[PDB]
Design a protein around this motif. Structure first.
Motif: not given
Length: 116
Positions: A73-81
């Motif tokens: 949320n804080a970085k406004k980033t979504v990750y895909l591992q």
């Protein structure tokens, strides 16, 4: 543009890779973020999605048990591992956003090439 991916590249079969999608301007509890992929000669397909507020996830059967989607949320980033990659996972991975079961914003895409 509202979304931008990063992380694509070359990966040995069996290896792992993490992709990122940074969102900017306009988010909240009603939006979902997702990853899609399109292999050469194939139609674009959903891979995974996550709700921004609840972190509720969805994984397509093809990658279920191997891929993990998360969001900061804080970085406004979504990750895909992506783990246990196979040559058949080679494709352009694109991130998108939307709400109400509709996707209306798209990133530029990132290439993931898995070789033997």
């Amino acid at each position: 543009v509202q979304l931008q991916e990063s992380g694509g590249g070359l990966v040995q079969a069996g290896g792992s890779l993490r992709l990122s999608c940074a969102a900017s301007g306009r988010t909240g509890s009603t939006y979902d973020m997702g990853w899609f992929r399109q292999a050469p000669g194939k139609e674009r397909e959903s891979v995974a999605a996550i709700n921004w507020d609840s972190a509720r996830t969805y994984y397509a059967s093809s990658v279920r048990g191997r891929f993990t989607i998360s969001r900061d949320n804080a970085k406004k980033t979504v990750y895909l591992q992506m783990n246990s990659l196979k040559p058949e996972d080679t494709a352009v991975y694109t991130c998108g956003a939307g709400e109400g079961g509709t996707w209306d914003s798209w990133g530029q895409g990132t290439q993931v090439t898995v070789s033997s």
